């Protein structure tokens, strides 16, 4: 009943206005804020202070404080975060980059 | 551990290729077209690469397959002429 | 040893090579030849565009006075506590010298031409048995 | 250049580990041991004293040296050097850590005062996800400022089982300044024992006792014994950078004007010098104490200058000296600024007009601009001539190359080139050359603020310099011709040229995805002659009707 | 992970390497023992490998006398391989130079008599590709040996080993 | 020393260029020369290629004018003191900007001649034309007072 | 099985509602042919009309939330202000009314 | 640097012709001609006079 | 801080709505796994009207 | 000494060598990267084993580049340095402060400390000739050397040896 | 000119990630690098005339790999170290 | 299941959790005065057995971290007395769907 009442909410305050967007955009901000059992404001602690990539953390101005806390408590970061893969380098498991291209001998084969 | 792919049946997957792999491997093919790898359908006399990777998708020739990431690790995998190119 | 580089075109080599530079593409290009030679350039003016240690000598300047992210009473800690290495160095008769110059020299309204000048003429003997004291006066003057 | 191959096994990057450095970590991977605080012209003109700036670490310009690895410049990465203290010291990054964990273990014992034996402790280390285990701890180990050797009654019947080491007291530590004072209460004279030790905990003394913490505790704790320890997390030996990461930025009119990071360097190691001379000579106790609190405080302001407002310990001139946290915090300090957004290359930048002689997909382009901008083309059977008659063009008209690419990295650029017209371009090259006709290109306008913004465009080169775009697309990138100016971004390779042409085009992106109607549609000037010409009283003749019909490209033919 | 320095040396008192010990798996699962080889029991299968992979090539474009051995074998790795194997022909030189059988069958029962024994794979492999009759002047040769085995028990293995071996 | 590719044609003996003529992008206008000493300025670590490390000042790279009235005098302390001025046409292009006294800023988008600019029965054929859609949503009513 | 079938309710309650028997025969007036026609491009263009898999919704949403939030305007408070409080709360009311019926 | 001034204007196809004379495939006897250096003042003319003639079809 | 918030959500090819942890946000996407685009606000037809009129 | 073990590789294939008969030809791009050839994990690698039936079956197309990614995995021979026990090599070059034994594939040296002080070296000789009763360095020169240690580099293998020991340099 | 978070965002929000790195890498740093496979640090010593990859400390002549890195990313590991912190592990030990 | 008038002293709820399994419940009247599922913004709540839950996870292929949480001092958790590990299935009235089915674990 609370993200129910919440989404009500958020619907009421942009719909005052330059109505609309679409109910799915809401409806996933709703739930990606809701979705600890709790409620979890967007701030600089909020969000941020979830068992979630050192590195996207310090993309979000607490930077050295947290890169401490990150180097004192020795933890790994998985690097399937799209700023992890940008800040090395690497093409992000994006759109594009949510496969792989393998070749086919067997096709290679058949189609001489 | 075992083997973290998937038979190719049951594979419960949409059969629709779509638009991400859609870009992915005409990119792909342009790039062996480009390098002088050997093209797989016959030539009209247009040179450009990305166009001949377009017709080689068009009548279905392409030697490559794809393979999704299930969240977990596990793999399903699908030849590009299984698929089917609607968009 | 002496770690030198001179650049050399390997397909040239007719001389101390006739090359060119292309600041605008910051590369270096064999200018008989053609072939690039190393790429990505530094930057030569724009370094000095973006804004004495010779005179104040090897050790280094500090003008350290008050900030403004603090308070008033920390800053007089600042300046209290900023005091406590003014004896190791002979960088404070330098600079206290160079104080005793300074007010001489603009004093006497002169130009910083001048200033410097008399800078380097203490800086250039600055400590000797020939200057044997007398008294800053003489040596200053 | 070729980048001086390798033949290392070129892998990505999958996973990153945190930690702290121990003290022989940084001296086994150390190359120099920095002594001289002075740095460059020993006499005084080159090839700088044995102190900072390369002895054996990164070179500076145009020599090979770096520590004798010889990647010129652009190669070597810089080699790390250390420097060793006289005094361990702090760490601003863990102060309230260690204030927190010297509150949870007991000195002279070294062990936790709550043992497996309060039933809500034991609840406490149960729980875990990182760290609210250890706040748990903290939180509950406020208490009982004596260390004790057997509490435990009720874990039984009532029998009373030791298990501690001390039967010490704890102070209560107050945090202040950039030290810890203690408070032994301790109530055990004759009477209550109103004397608390304010005594200034020594960082000596702090490292011996994280020394002597369980490896158990360290896990209870939330420390990774391999890669994070609490007698690591006190700074004893310093490394320090190369100077790749402080270059003296070689003032460019005479001079180096060298810079801060470096003269912060020189600082500490000045106060380093003077700690131990002072204590190897006679030391009256009355110079050690704020001869170390200096070397502490530098240590300090060289990590943070954005601590608690008492010092703020500028330089030279009034500016202050910026710190690392300065120089990685948020607006363009290293993450916001060079990491997550940067320049780029292959950019363009002009303002913009209407034309209704543009269809969607295309952008009106200077000639100047592509004549600037360029593109490599692998060089096949199919394109061999007109690559040929492209180079032989030259680098001054418009349909023509810049730069031309052999197998091995080599640019052979072609405005010298007195060979030009005896190159014979052999295949598997790169030629780099103008931007032709429709090729795909993508397109901005700040600020960007949802999908649309970011899209491409074929290109048809025109004269007259200025961008040249279709009235209908105007909406979406929001702009109107009062002086507004966009961007340019040419791809530079067949995949990223397959995919913007295959996603980021425009005439596949009419249906606006945040709000399901079309973001695009017909404006002002055509919307009024739209309605005028569709009215039932009006009427067109024959020569007009004519004109109109072949105005339409696609027309069929029959009137 | 801690720097792991492990230091290891080599020799016959079960002081093996970790980078070779003994029980690996293999890939498809099942558990692979470390194979350890004779010098003579080398001298044959560089034989079979060279003489299977031959007539796969005879097949593929259709679809014991060292002498001449060595030089042939050589011609047919020049046939396909390059000539930079000078270090491979110093291999099997070495090879026929000091391998204990010239021939196969000996091989062949030693190893038969080897695998109802049951000895120390690289213990027993070492012995192979030494080539010595003398049990006492090995165990003098090499401590770890003298310190392993039994002279009595070496000895009534080597003469039986000794009196089938092609001798020298 | 790595002195650029200007040309520098353009000076004279005295360094300086000449009032009067043309400059393009890259010419320069101003020698300079390192003085210094010590730096063994002519015998040590630069062949001659004498003492020049030079600074010379070229002029931006786009712009080309015409080098007009150049002075020198000593600066507060006595110097050698220089300052230059350079003159360009600037004729009105596509892009430029024009406005109004009412706040309609606005740009060239392209440029006809007379015989198909539109025209009136006097002839008085028109310096520019703005669209109408300017006028409602802006509300400039004084505009069209004042014509 | 079972989320498959609970997820197509609303469009086939009103794909029900439009070809229901009666009013397909008395208004529409469709063929056998036509029929078929108008079920496969049906089928046709919802199996086109699923999410493809792979892209990025919460960046897609963020937007769409964000640039109408630019062009909002600034009793009972309203507008950027309530929409910061509800989307970054912070327990403070400002208008903690609650509506009873 | 390679911005056309007006020189290109009204000088007649250098290197060039004056018209080309390509046919058309969508309709029987049908010809496209592409005039260059040449404008509205010719244009115009052209195709008012060959519209007033009655023997063709079609002309724009 | 939106934008931020809510990168790296991805839609997976098990039609979750899933973070970069697979922690689920949405089970089917959307609760219909439909587009964004391919909607519109086509009306229901048997809301409305009269019992009597629906049965006619 | 010589070694079998499964082992794996990691190879690339341009895009050009996409013909419809790549199997045999990776085989044979096996062959000459596989035979020949020296590491420090696996030392000198020798020859392979298991022609048939091999291991490659599947490949990736690298990102960035048209090359494709393959891995094999195969059994092969090897040899791996020891040290500490003897072996009986041959030596064909020789220096002034010792012998070079080519044993096989690589080079050991014995330095002029590690030979014994008591062992009556004669510098006037070709080769220089450090013998006392029989083992004269010839063109055959059977030294029983005992590798002190093969100290591993990077692909460029190199060992030492001494014959400070009783039938030591003595076969 | 500039690429700043807004546009790699909407960059995201397309979807053409191989296009977002190419940006990334191409039209800027694109630097080398050399990683020890143990210390998983960049103190790995590669005479590249010699092919020796030395990695001192961890004191191995073996495990070395090359990786591409953004040059601003290999300075911030710089003065992350500077700031005694970041161990690079080339591939996955978590499955 | 325990009702308590007012207020419950903490000696009188120290031993609460003492004799596993046996599980002891407290509540006001206050918080029973109305049924909290009777709210129209409360959807439904059912439980799940540990075999389907089971089954859950091995359709899905979550391991039993990345669902969605409840808090235990929930109210709806409060009313139907599960305890930690346990899942919740949830339908809702959901507007682009109509009926939608949604999981949620106790921890
Ligand atoms: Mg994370
Ligand atoms: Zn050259
Ligand atoms: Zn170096
Ligand atoms: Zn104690
Ligand atoms: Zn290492």
């Known amino acids: 009943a609370g993200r129910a009442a919440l989404y009500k909410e958020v619907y009421n305050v942009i719909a005052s206005d330059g109505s609309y967007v679409n109910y799915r955009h809401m409806a996933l901000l709703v739930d990606v804020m809701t979705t600890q059992g709790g409620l979890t404001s967007v701030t600089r602690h909020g969000f941020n202070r979830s068992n979630t990539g050192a590195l996207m953390r310090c993309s979000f101005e607490e930077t050295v404080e947290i890169l401490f806390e990150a180097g004192a408590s020795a933890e790994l970061d998985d690097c399937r975060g799209v700023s992890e893969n940008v800040i090395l380098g690497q093409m992000a498991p994006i759109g594009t980059g949510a496969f792989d291209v393998m070749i086919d001998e067997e096709s290679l084969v058949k189609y001489m | 551990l075992k083997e973290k792919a998937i038979p190719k049946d049951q594979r419960a997957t949409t059969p629709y290729m779509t638009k991400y792999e859609r870009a992915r491997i005409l990119g792909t093919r342009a790039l062996q077209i480009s390098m002088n790898a050997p093209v797989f359908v016959d030539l009209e006399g247009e040179t450009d690469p990305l166009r001949i990777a377009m017709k080689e998708l068009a009548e279905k020739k392409i030697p490559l397959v794809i393979r999704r990431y299930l969240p977990d690790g596990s793999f399903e995998d699908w030849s590009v002429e299984e698929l089917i190119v609607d968009l | 040893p002496n770690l030198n580089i001179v650049l050399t075109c390997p397909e040239c080599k007719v001389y101390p090579p006739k090359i060119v530079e292309r600041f605008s593409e910051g590369d270096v290009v064999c200018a008989l030849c053609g072939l690039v030679l190393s790429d990505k350039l530094v930057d030569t003016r724009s370094e000095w565009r973006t804004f004495n240690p010779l005179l104040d000598g090897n050790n280094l300047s500090t003008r350290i006075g008050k900030g403004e992210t603090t308070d008033m009473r920390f800053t007089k800690e600042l300046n209290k506590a900023q005091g406590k290495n003014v004896m190791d160095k002979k960088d404070n008769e330098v600079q206290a010298a160079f104080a005793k110059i300074t007010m001489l020299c603009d004093a006497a309204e002169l130009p910083k031409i001048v200033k410097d000048c008399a800078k380097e003429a203490y800086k250039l003997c600055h400590d000797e048995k020939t200057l044997k004291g007398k008294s800053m006066e003489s040596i200053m003057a | 250049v070729g980048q001086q191959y390798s033949s290392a096994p070129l892998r990505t990057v999958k996973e990153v580990q945190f930690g702290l450095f121990s003290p022989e970590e940084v001296r086994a991977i150390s190359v120099a041991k920095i002594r001289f605080p002075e740095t460059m012209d020993e006499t005084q003109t080159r090839a700088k004293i044995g102190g900072l700036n390369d002895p054996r670490l990164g070179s500076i310009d145009r020599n090979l040296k770096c520590q004798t690895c010889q990647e010129g410049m652009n190669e070597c990465p810089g080699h790390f050097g250390h420097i060793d203290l006289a005094k361990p010291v702090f760490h601003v990054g863990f102060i309230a850590k260690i204030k927190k964990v010297c509150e949870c273990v007991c000195m002279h014992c070294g062990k936790l005062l709550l043992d497996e034996h309060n039933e809500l402790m034991r609840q406490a280390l149960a729980i875990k996800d990182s760290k609210k285990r250890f706040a748990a701890i903290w939180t509950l180990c406020k208490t009982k400022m ?319 310099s200025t961008f040249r775009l279709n009235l209908s697309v105007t909406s979406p990138y929001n702009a109107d011709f009062d002086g507004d100016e966009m961007n340019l971004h040419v791809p530079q390779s067949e995949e990223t040229r397959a995919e913007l042409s295959q996603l980021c085009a425009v005439p596949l992106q009419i249906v606006s995805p945040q709000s399901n109607k079309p973001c695009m549609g017909i404006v002002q000037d055509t919307l009024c002659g739209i309605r005028k010409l569709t009215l039932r009283d009006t009427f067109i003749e024959l020569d007009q009707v004519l004109n109109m019909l072949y105005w339409v490209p696609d027309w069929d033919g029959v009137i | 992970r801690l720097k792991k320095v492990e230091e290891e040396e080599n020799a016959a008192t079960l002081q093996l390497g970790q ?150 | 020393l790595r002195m650029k590719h200007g040309t520098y044609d353009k000076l004279d003996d005295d360094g300086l260029i000449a009032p009067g003529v043309r400059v393009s992008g890259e010419d320069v206008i101003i020698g300079k020369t390192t003085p210094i000493s010590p730096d063994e300025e002519e015998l040590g670590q630069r062949t001659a290629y004498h003492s020049k490390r030079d600074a010379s000042t070229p002029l931006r790279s786009t712009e080309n004018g015409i080098v007009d009235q150049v002075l020198v005098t000593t600066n507060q302390d006595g110097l050698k003191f220089v300052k230059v001025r350079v003159r360009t046409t600037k004729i009105p292009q596509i892009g430029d900007k024009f406005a109004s006294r009412h706040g309609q800023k606005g740009t060239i988008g392209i440029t006809y001649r007379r015989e198909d600019m539109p025209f009136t029965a006097e002839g008085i054929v028109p310096d520019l034309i703005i669209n109408p859609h300017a006028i409602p949503s802006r509300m400039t009513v004084a505009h069209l007072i004042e014509c | 099985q079972n989320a498959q079938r609970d997820a197509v309710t609303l469009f086939c309650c009103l794909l029900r509602s439009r070809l229901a028997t009666r009013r397909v025969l008395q208004e529409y007036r469709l063929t056998k042919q036509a029929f078929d026609w108008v079920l496969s491009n049906i089928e046709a263009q919802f199996l086109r009309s699923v999410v493809h898999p792979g892209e990025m919704v919460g960046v897609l949403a963020a937007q769409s939330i964000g640039e109408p939030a630019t062009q909002m305007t600034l009793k009972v408070t309203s507008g950027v202000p309530r929409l910061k409080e509800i989307l970054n709360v912070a327990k403070n009311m400002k208008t903690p009314s609650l509506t009873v019926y | 640097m390679n911005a056309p001034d007006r020189f290109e204007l009204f000088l007649l196809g250098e290197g060039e012709s004056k018209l080309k004379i390509d046919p058309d495939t969508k309709a029987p006897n049908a010809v496209v001609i592409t005039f260059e250096k040449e404008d509205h003042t010719l244009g115009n003319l052209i195709r008012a006079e060959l519209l007033n003639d009655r023997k063709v079809l079609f002309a724009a | 801080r939106l934008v931020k918030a809510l990168e790296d959500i991805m839609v997976h090819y098990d039609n979750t709505t899933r973070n970069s942890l697979g922690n689920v946000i949405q089970f089917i996407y959307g609760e219909d796994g439909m587009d964004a685009a391919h909607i519109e606000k086509q009306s229901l037809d048997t809301i409305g009207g009269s019992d009597a009129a629906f049965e006619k | 000494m010589f070694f079998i073990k499964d082992l794996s590789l990691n190879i690339t294939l341009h895009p050009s060598f996409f013909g419809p008969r790549m199997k045999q030809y990776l085989k044979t791009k096996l062959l000459e990267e596989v035979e020949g050839s020296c590491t420090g994990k696996f030392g000198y690698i020798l020859c392979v084993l298991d022609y048939d039936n091999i291991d490659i079956q599947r490949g990736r197309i690298l990102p960035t580049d048209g090359s494709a990614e393959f891995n094999v995995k195969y059994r092969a021979v090897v040899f791996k340095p020891f040290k500490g026990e003897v072996v009986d090599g041959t030596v064909v070059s020789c220096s002034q402060h010792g012998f070079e034994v080519q044993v096989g594939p690589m080079k050991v040296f014995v330095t002029k400390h590690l030979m014994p002080q008591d062992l009556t070296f004669n510098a006037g000789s070709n080769p220089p000739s450090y013998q006392s009763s029989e083992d004269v360095i010839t063109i055959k020169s059977r030294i029983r050397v005992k590798i002190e240690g093969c100290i591993s580099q990077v692909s460029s293998i190199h060992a030492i040896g001494s014959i400070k020991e009783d039938y030591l340099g003595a076969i | 000119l500039r690429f700043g978070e807004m546009e790699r965002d909407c960059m995201i929000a397309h979807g053409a990630a191989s296009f977002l790195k190419e940006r990334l890498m191409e039209a800027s740093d694109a630097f080398r690098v050399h990683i020890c496979g143990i210390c998983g640090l960049m103190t790995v010593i590669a005479k590249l005339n010699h092919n020796q990859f030395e990695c001192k400390g961890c004191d191995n002549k073996i495990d070395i790999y090359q990786i591409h890195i953004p040059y601003a990313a290999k300075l911030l590991f710089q003065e992350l170290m500077a700031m005694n912190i970041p161990r690079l592990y080339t591939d996955r030990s978590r499955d | 299941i325990f009702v308590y008038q007012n207020n419950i002293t903490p000696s009188a709820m120290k031993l609460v959790p003492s004799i596993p399994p046996a599980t002891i419940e407290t509540f006001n009247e206050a918080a029973l005065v109305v049924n909290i599922t009777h709210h129209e913004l409360v959807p439904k709540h059912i439980r799940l057995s540990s075999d389907e839950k089971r089954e859950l996870l091995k359709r899905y292929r979550l391991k039993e971290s990345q669902l969605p949480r409840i808090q235990r001092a929930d109210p709806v958790a409060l009313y139907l007395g599960l305890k930690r590990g346990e899942v919740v299935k949830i339908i809702r009235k959901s507007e682009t769907s109509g009926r939608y089915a949604s999981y949620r674990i106790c921890m």
């Open chain 4, 146 to 464: 004596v260390c004790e050797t057997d509490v435990p009654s009720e874990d039984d019947p009532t029998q009373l089982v030791s298990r501690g080491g001390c039967g010490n007291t704890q102070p209560t530590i107050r945090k202040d300044g950039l030290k810890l004072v203690g408070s032994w209460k301790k109530d055990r004279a004759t009477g209550d024992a109103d004397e608390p030790e304010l005594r200034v905990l020594s960082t000596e003394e702090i490292l011996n006792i994280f020394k002597h913490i369980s490896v158990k505790d360290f896990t209870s704790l939330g420390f990774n014994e391999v890669f994070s320890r609490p007698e690591w997390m006190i700074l004893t030996c310093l490394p320090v950078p190369p100077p790749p990461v402080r270059p003296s930025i070689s003032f460019n009119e005479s001079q180096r004007g060298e810079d801060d990071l470096t003269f912060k360097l020189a600082d500490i190691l000045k106060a380093n010098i003077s700690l131990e001379t002072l204590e190897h000579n006679g030391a009256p106790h009355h110079a050690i104490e704020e001869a170390e609190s200096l070397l502490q405080f530098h240590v300090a302001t060289y990590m943070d200058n954005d601590i608690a407002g008492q010092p703020q310990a500028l330089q030279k001139s009034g500016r202050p000296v910026k710190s690392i946290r300065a120089r990685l915090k948020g607006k363009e300090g290293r993450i916001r600024g060079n990491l997550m957004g940067k320049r780029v290359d292959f950019s363009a930048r002009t303002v913009i007009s209407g034309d209704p002689n543009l269809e969607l997909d295309q952008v009106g382009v200077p000639k100047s601009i592509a004549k600037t901008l360029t593109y490599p083309e692998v060089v096949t059977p199919y394109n061999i001539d007109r690559l040929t008659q492209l180079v032989r063009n030259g680098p001054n008209e418009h349909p023509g190359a810049k730069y031309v690419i052999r197998d091995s990295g080599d640019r052979i650029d072609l405005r010298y080139s007195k060979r030009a017209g005896d190159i014979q371009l052999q295949y598997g090259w790169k030629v780099e050359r103008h931007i032709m006709d429709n090729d795909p290109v993508l397109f901005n306008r700040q600020p960007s603020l949802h999908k649309m913004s970011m899209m491409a465009h074929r290109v048809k080169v025109i004269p007259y």
């Open chain 5, 19 to 168: 980078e070779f010990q003994l029980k690996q798996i293999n890939h498809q699962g099942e558990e692979e023992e470390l194979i350890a080889l004779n010098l003579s029991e080398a001298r044959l299968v560089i034989k079979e490998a060279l003489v299977e992979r031959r007539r796969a090539f005879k097949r593929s474009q259709k679809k014991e006398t060292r002498e001449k051995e060595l030089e042939s074998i050589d011609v047919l790795l020049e046939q396909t391989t390059g000539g930079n194997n000078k270090d491979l022909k110093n291999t099997m030189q070495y090879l026929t130079n000091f391998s204990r059988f010239r021939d196969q069958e000996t091989v062949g029962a030693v190893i038969q008599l080897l695998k109802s024994t049951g000895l120390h794979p690289f213990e027993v492999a070492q012995l192979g590709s030494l080539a010595c009759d003398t049990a006492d002047e090995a165990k003098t040769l090499i401590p770890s040996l003298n310190n392993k085995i039994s002279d009595d028990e070496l000895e009534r293995i080597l003469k039986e080993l000794s009196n089938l071996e092609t001798l020298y």
